[PDB]
Design a protein around this nucleic acid. Structure first.
Ligand SMILES: [Mg+2]
Ligand SMILES: [Mg+2]
Ligand SMILES: [Mg+2]
Ligand SMILES: [Mg+2]
Ligand SMILES: [Mg+2]
Ligand SMILES: [Mg+2]
Ligand SMILES: [Mg+2]
Ligand SMILES: [Mg+2]
Ligand SMILES: [Mg+2]
Ligand SMILES: [Mg+2]
Ligand SMILES: [Mg+2]
Ligand SMILES: [Mg+2]
Ligand SMILES: [Mg+2]
Ligand SMILES: [Mg+2]
Ligand SMILES: [Mg+2]
Ligand SMILES: [Mg+2]
Ligand SMILES: [Mg+2]
Ligand SMILES: [Mg+2]
Ligand SMILES: [Mg+2]
Lengths: 58, 116, 94, 136, 77
RNA sequence: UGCCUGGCGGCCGUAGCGCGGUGGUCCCACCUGACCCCAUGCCGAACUCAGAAGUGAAACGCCGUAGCGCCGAUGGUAGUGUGGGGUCUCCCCAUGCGAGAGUAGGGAACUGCCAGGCA
RNA sequence: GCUCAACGGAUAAAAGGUACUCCGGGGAUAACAGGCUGAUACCGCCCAAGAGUUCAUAUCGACGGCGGUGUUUGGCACCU
RNA sequence: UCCUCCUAAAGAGUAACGGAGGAGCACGAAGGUUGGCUAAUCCUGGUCGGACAUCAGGAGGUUAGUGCAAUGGCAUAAGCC
RNA sequence: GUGAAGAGGGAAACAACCCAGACCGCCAGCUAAGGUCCCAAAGUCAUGGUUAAGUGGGAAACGAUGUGGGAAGGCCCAGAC
């Protein structure tokens, strides 16, 4: 019902393969990209996993 | 212990009959009595039981707890379980040597229509 | 005769305890069977001076939390491995 | 010289040395020499620091050594290339973590105990400290 | 120095189908050396103590027994 | 319906061992006898047959007692995934997970299906 | 019917010298020199049992500990 | 060339001229099945007899056993008749 | 994970380390690691402390009335050092 906005603030050059896939799961492509995803315990579990390259506005 | 040594003497046959998932006819023997009961493949609940302590059987018996007594209870078990639809059971020794009253208990039950 | 002041800990855990210990305070708890246990925090410099006394572990103490006096006895003490410091002290509601 | 007799295996892995020690309090005597540093401490330094202690007091009290090497250390010979097996065991070391109580003694005044432990603390590589018995 | 340098090929033991997995009939569940896991309901036992399915279903690990021994069974679900 | 007892399970030491008391109408147990049905690498000691005189001593069941066994928090400690840092053969910070040992304590089980005896 | 045990087994059947030597390659790999390291070597220091008629430190200094240099013997194989 | 444990970082696998040990067989019963049985080590008492043989009681519990190295296993015994 | 097969900015110079992945052009703007006295673009910026050693801008056991902060302790105007 409520959408949540996620912005990538750091690059994904030397990251673990489990954090490159999380960004693909969220949909982020390059630093500065902002996507509007649905709020969900599964979606917020991706944000927590990579909560050093992404910035969530709320 | 005289009973504990017998209990572990009958465990292997008793657990195989449960893994096999077959109805079994456990037989308990006493120097003064003899018991028999048909226990479901579950192992927890019984279907048919007949024993020398039953007053319907003991009054016709000169001395409950001999070969002639074991023959009477075996007939009772088989006929009691015949109207219940149980025909295919497996005999359980319960550790007693299949040689005396248990043999007559089985033989009379075997002859009375039960198939095992 | 020993009276020590303490406050109820808002947050507990490994991370929150090490922040307490860097501010000259260390955690403690009070458990007495028929009542729920109470986790407290109390200053380190004050209690380390008294705990050197031989009577600290024998005498019934008194703890002033939220204004209420609780009479306790020192059950166990966790010391720093190689420093004259404390890490955790168990009070039983005696 | 402290050294295990009848060990299960001749040679033992190098391993690592992490964490704090277990015997961090005086349990037999009343004054103890407690480590603050880290590092293996051979059997030759254990005896060299015991002699400096049974000579400072020289008549009184009992002394407990709360460490035992039980760790074989192998050294390669000289002018030998690498490989071709493991070295031949040379000495034995007692791995020490901070907080371990190495020596401790009872039966002497604290001033004599304090100075005697200072004579042994100058023969051990690690940084030691003086600790006294508590109540718990 | 030397007199060593011998070993054997790894036997690839261990549980193959973990709990909750849907297996067929005859599919190996666990390869063992002794009897670490005992055969329960609807599973067999090889000559080398390999535990194999006997009816298609879902694997189940349980700790039945007087001596608290691990058992493997199958639910025909 | 209640109590006592036997058989078969569930459950697996909070469920076992120790110490004390108690039970014999029925049940159970010891027990009498042995040519017979069966047996002893000798012995009816065990197994087995034929019975009921005696007993509740042993065993078994029940009840009581924590001396052990056993279960065991809260708090703290160790460890550790991800991201940073240090004087980086070892550690610290943010965050998530979080023991083992020990302490307070719990604790001498609970339960299902049949079959007897009594009130 | 094969210690085809060099055990996925080149033939049924096989040892050496070359300083009289030769060809194709390699700094993928050694000897000299350089390089990284510093166990070893040299130098210095810390505690003080003792020797020194008394007195540890005039001069030495056991049992132990901490470093420096890159001068030895070595380790590695990075450059040719 | 083959087998067992560790290194091997709690699925599988994982190297070194790394740390430790084994195999090139045996058995016509040491296999199958049915029936039955439960050890080591200690105490006490007992002729030769003894620290230690065989026996009778009690504690203990599988600390024994497995044709053969090590690991996993085994009381329903896979151990013993 | 990067280099190999990856340029660009930083660490003076320095394939691997930190930031970050170049389709092309622009005399446009915002940032990352790193920095703002001159060489050399940007604070001779603001508040409160520490250092007297050029420490910063190489290294230990060990030694010392260097200096700042903290909790206690002994004696002392029936007069302390
Ligand atoms: Mg080959
Ligand atoms: Mg070939
Ligand atoms: Mg010539
Ligand atoms: Mg010539
Ligand atoms: Mg040539
Ligand atoms: Mg080279
Ligand atoms: Mg190389
Ligand atoms: Mg593995
Ligand atoms: Mg792993
Ligand atoms: Mg690989
Ligand atoms: Mg065999
Ligand atoms: Mg058998
Ligand atoms: Mg067999
Ligand atoms: Mg680059
Ligand atoms: Mg440049
Ligand atoms: Mg691109
Ligand atoms: Mg800007
Ligand atoms: Mg400028
Ligand atoms: Mg400088």
């Amino acid at each position: 019902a409520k959408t949540i906005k996620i912005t990538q603030t750091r690059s994904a050059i030397g990251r673990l393969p489990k954090h490159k896939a999380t960004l693909l799961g969220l949909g982020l492509r390059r630093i500065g990209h902002t996507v509007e995803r649905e709020d969900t315990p599964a979606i917020r579990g991706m944000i927590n996993a990579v909560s050093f390259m992404v910035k969530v506005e709320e | 212990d005289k009973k504990s040594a017998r209990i572990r003497r009958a465990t292997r046959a008793r657990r195989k009959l449960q893994e096999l998932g077959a109805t079994r006819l456990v037989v308990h023997r006493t120097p003064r009595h003899i018991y028999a009961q048909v226990i479901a493949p579950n192992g927890s609940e019984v279907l048919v039981a007949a024993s020398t302590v039953e007053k319907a059987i003991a009054e016709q018996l000169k001395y409950t707890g001999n070969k002639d007594a074991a023959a009477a209870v075996g007939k009772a078990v088989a006929e009691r379980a015949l109207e219940k639809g149980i025909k295919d059971v497996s005999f359980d020794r319960s550790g007693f040597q299949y040689h005396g009253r248990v043999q007559a208990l089985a033989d009379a039950a075997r002859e009375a229509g039960l198939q095992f | 005769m020993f009276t020590i002041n303490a406050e109820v800990r808002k947050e507990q855990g490994k991370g929150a305890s090490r922040r307490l210990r860097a501010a000259n305070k260390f955690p403690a708890i009070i458990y007495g069977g028929k009542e729920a246990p109470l986790a407290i925090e109390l200053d380190h410099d004050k209690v380390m001076n008294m705990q050197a006394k031989a009577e600290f572990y024998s005498e019934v103490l008194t703890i002033v939390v939220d204004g209420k006096e609780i009479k306790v006895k020192a059950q166990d003490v966790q010391r720093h491995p190689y420093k004259p410091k404390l890490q955790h002290i168990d009070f039983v509601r005696a | 010289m402290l050294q295990p007799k009848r060990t299960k295996f001749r040679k033992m892995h190098k391993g690592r040395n992490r964490g704090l020690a277990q015997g961090t309090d005086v349990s037999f005597g009343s004054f103890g020499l407690k480590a603050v540093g880290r590092g293996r401490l051979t059997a030759r330094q254990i005896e060299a620091a015991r002699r400096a202690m049974t000579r400072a007091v020289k008549r009184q009290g009992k002394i407990w050594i709360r460490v035992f090497p039980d760790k074989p250390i192998t050294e390669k010979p000289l002018a030998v290339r690498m490989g071709k097996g493991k070295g031949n065991v040379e000495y034995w070391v007692a791995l020490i973590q901070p907080g371990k109580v190495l020596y401790e003694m009872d039966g002497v005044p604290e001033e004599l105990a304090r100075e005697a432990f200072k004579l042994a603390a100058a023969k051990l590589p690690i940084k030691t400290t003086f600790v006294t018995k508590t109540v718990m | 120095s030397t007199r060593n340098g011998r070993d054997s090929e790894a036997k690839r033991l261990g549980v193959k189908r973990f709990g909750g997995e849907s297996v067929l009939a005859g599919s190996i569940i666990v390869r063992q050396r002794g009897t670490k896991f005992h055969a329960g309901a609807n599973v067999g036992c090889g000559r080398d103590h390999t535990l194999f399915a006997k009816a298609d279903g879902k694997v189940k690990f349980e700790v039945k027994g007087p001596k608290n021994r691990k058992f493997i069974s199958i639910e025909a679900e």
